[PDB]
């Protein structure tokens, strides 16, 4: 089998992407944030504290003839940005772009943190990291991809995120029309449960490429590109007036600037992030200070190749027995 679904930016900055997902019988369609940095499929629901729902579409398990309470199971997750959610668990039928999994764990939120409430466009998350990170207790549950894998034509999914435009998540096949050149594959460590890999270096604008190993994760659920402070300083030093602001929480730059590109290495290949992808707009409405899309990972403990990096590439998440990542230009 295969599946193919369009993913759409939630706003004009590409702060996140939402993909429609069918849950239950009859189908209830929710717009989920596909997150290769976590492993829980959770949704706003009829069980979510009413004061914490503000515009989201909710899953109502009592209206699904295929929903079954997963008795005794609970979940609780905290994300790198400080947000969190928790609740209980149902199993139900879940379909993405025509690909159906029966018996998928659908984690129903009883509580969500304020950042989720305040984002009316995101109805939940669909985790695509390794199932070893799934938070369901006492019986850990498998991701949608892990459940689908054996049925897929090939044990892969691909992320093709757009810049200020829709893109595509495919399951089970690699669309050879969706990229240019060849796909360069690179080794993955699953030891932390992430799609963790080592970039071979970087360049700023038209500058010379610096060969240096940068271990990080391919994370569709993170907006920005988080890299070591040395790399990030070298980038922003090429933008007149750019500075790290403790009050704002990262590098800012004059909105009048033209940003240089940023290149990262994948083996001997190179992915070029255009400068415009690094502009996240005014820090507050009407400000002439703009927020940068490349930020330091120093306070995080891991480098994160988030959407800013991934949207410059066609990305293959290869879930074969030895997983690997593939990157192509597009
Ligand atoms: C670090 N990324 C996590 C945190 C978050 C917040 C809003 C939407 C998605 C996600 C995944």
DSSP 39-62: --EEE-BTTS-GGG-SS---B-GG
Give the angle subtended at the CA of 85 by the CAs of 103 and 303, to the nearest 5°: 95
The DSSP result for 223-262, as a single string, is: -SEEE-HHHHHHHHTTSTT-EEETTTTEEEEETTPPPPPE
Could you count the other beta carbons within 10 Å of the beta carbon of residue 90? 25
Gap from CA of 240 to ligand 1 centroid (Å): 31
Is the CB of 14 within 6 Å of ligand 1? no
CA of 79 to the centre of ligand 1 (A): 6
For residue 210, report the distance from its CA to the centre of ligand 1, in Å: 31
Beta strands 41-43 and 124-127, pairing class: antiparallel
The backbone torsions φ and ψ at residue 97, rounded to the nearest 5 degrees and listed phi first, read 55, 35
Whether 250 lines ligand 1, by a CB cut-off of 6 Å, is no
Count the neighbouring beta carbons within 10 Å of the beta carbon of residue 126: 27
Residues 6+ apart with CB under 8 A from 248: 283, 289, 291
- For the chain, the first-to-last Cα distance in angstroms comes to 25
Determine phi and psi for 253, rounding to 5 degrees.
Answer: -150, 155
Q: Which atom of ligand 1 is nearest to the CA of 222?
A: 2
Q: State how far the Cα of 81 lies from the Cα of 110, in Å rounded to an integer.
A: 20
Report which DSSP code applies to 183.
P
Which residue stretches of the chain are H helix?
A: 114-117, 144-148, 229-236, 307-310
Q: Quote the DSSP letter at residue 137.
A: B
Q: Give residue 83 CA to ligand 1 midpoint distance, Å.
A: 7
The verdict on the CB of residue 124 being under 6 Å from ligand 1 is no
Q: Is 306 in the pocket of ligand 1 (CB under 6 A)?
A: no
Which residues carry out catalysis?
Answer: 35, 199
CB 176 within 8 A of CB 192: no
83 Cβ inside 6 Å of ligand 1:
yes
User: Checking DSSP bridges between strand 225-227 and strand 294-296, what pairing results, if any?
Assistant: parallel
The atom number, within ligand 1, closest to the CA of 35 reads 11
Question: Can you name the CATH fold of 175-330?
Answer: Cathepsin D, subunit A; domain 1 (2.40.70)
**Secondary structure tally for the chain: helices H, strands E:** 4, 24
- Token couple for 304: 């994160």
Backbone angles phi, psi at 58, to 5 degrees: -110, 150
On the question of a cis peptide bond just before residue 11, with omega within 30 degrees of 0, the verdict is no
CATH label, 5-174, candidates 2.40.70.10, 1.10.3210.10, 3.40.50.720, 3.40.50.1980:
2.40.70.10
Ligand 1: centre distance to CA 81 (Å): 7
What technique determined this structure? X-ray
Those residues whose C-beta lies under 8 Å from the C-beta of residue 216, and which sit 6 or more positions away, are: 196, 197, 198, 199, 226, 227, 297, 302, 303, 304, 305
121 within ligand 1 shell (Cβ under 6 A): no
- According to DSSP, the β-strands at 303-305 and 210-218 are parallel
- Domain parsing of the chain, residue ranges: 5-174, 175-330
Cα→Cα distances 51→110, 187, 282, Å: 11, 45, 30
Contact (Cβ atoms closer than 8 angstroms) between residue 170 and residue 3? yes
Fold match between 5-174 and 175-330?
yes
CA distance 2 to 98: 7
| Vertex 126: Cα angle to 269 and 95 (nearest 5) | 105
Match 């988030």 to its residue by tokens. Answer: 306
Cα–Cα dist 28/21, whole Å: 8
- Assess contact for 31 and 123: CB atoms under 8 A: yes
Cα 197 from Cα 275, distance rounded (Å):
24
Find tokens 């700023």 and name the residue: 204
Cβ proximity of 68 and 91 under 8 Å: yes
Which of 83, 216, 218 is the pocket-test mutation for ligand 1 (most atoms within 8 Å of CB)?
A: 83
Look at residue 133 and give its three-state secondary structure.
helix
Residue 323, SS3 per DSSP? coil
Q: Is 74 in the pocket of ligand 1 (CB under 6 A)?
A: no
Which strand ranges, in their side-by-side order, compose the sheet holding 262-266? Answer: 269-273, 262-266, 196-204, 210-218, 303-305, 225-227, 294-296
Cα of 33 from ligand 1 centre, angstroms: 8
> Does the C-beta of 275 come closer than 6 Å to ligand 1?
no
Ranges of H-type helices in 54-197: 114-117, 144-148
Whether the bond into 106 is cis, omega within 30 of 0: no
How far apart CA 230 and CA 241 sit, in angstroms, is 18
Cα distance between residue 145 and residue 19, in whole Å: 15
């Amino acid at each position: 089998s295969t599946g193919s679904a369009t993913t759409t930016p939630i706003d004009s900055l590409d702060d996140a992407y939402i993909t429609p997902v069918q849950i239950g019988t009859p189908a209830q369609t929710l717009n989920l944030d596909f997150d290769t940095g976590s492993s829980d499929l959770w949704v706003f629901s009829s069980e979510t504290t009413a004061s914490e729902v503000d515009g989201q579409t909710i899953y109502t398990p009592s209206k699904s003839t295929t929903a079954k309470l997963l008795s005794g199971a609970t979940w609780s997750i905290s994300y790198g940005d400080g947000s969190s959610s928790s609740g209980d668990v149902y199993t139900d039928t879940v379909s993405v772009g025509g690909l159906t999994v029966t018996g998928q764990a659908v984690e129903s939120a009883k509580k969500v943190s304020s950042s989720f409430t305040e984002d009316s466009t995101i109805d939940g998350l669909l985790g695509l990291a390794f199932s070893t990170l799934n938070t369901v207790s006492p019986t850990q549950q498998k991701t949608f991809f892990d459940n689908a894998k054996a049925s897929l034509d090939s044990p892969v999914f691909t992320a093709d995120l757009g810049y200020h435009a829709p893109g595509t998540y495919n399951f089970g096949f690699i669309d050879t029309t969706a990229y240019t050149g060849s796909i360069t594959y690179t080794a993955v460590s699953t030891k932390q449960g992430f799609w963790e890999w080592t970039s071979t270096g970087y360049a700023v604008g038209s500058g010379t490429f610096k060969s240096t190993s940068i271990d990080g994760i391919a994370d569709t659920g993170t907006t920005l590109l988080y890299l070591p402070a040395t790399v990030v300083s070298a980038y922003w030093a090429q933008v007149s007036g750019a500075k790290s602001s403790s009050s704002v929480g990262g590098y800012v730059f004059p909105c009048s600037a033209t940003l240089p590109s940023f290149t990262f290495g994948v083996g001997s290949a190179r992915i070029v992030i255009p400068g415009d992808y690094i502009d996240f707009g005014p820090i507050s409405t009407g400000s002439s200070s703009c927020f940068g899309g490349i930020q330091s990972s120093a306070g995080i403990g891991i480098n994160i190749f988030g959407d800013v990096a991934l949207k410059a590439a066609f990305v293959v998440f290869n879930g074969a027995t030895t997983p690997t990542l593939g990157f192509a230009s597009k």
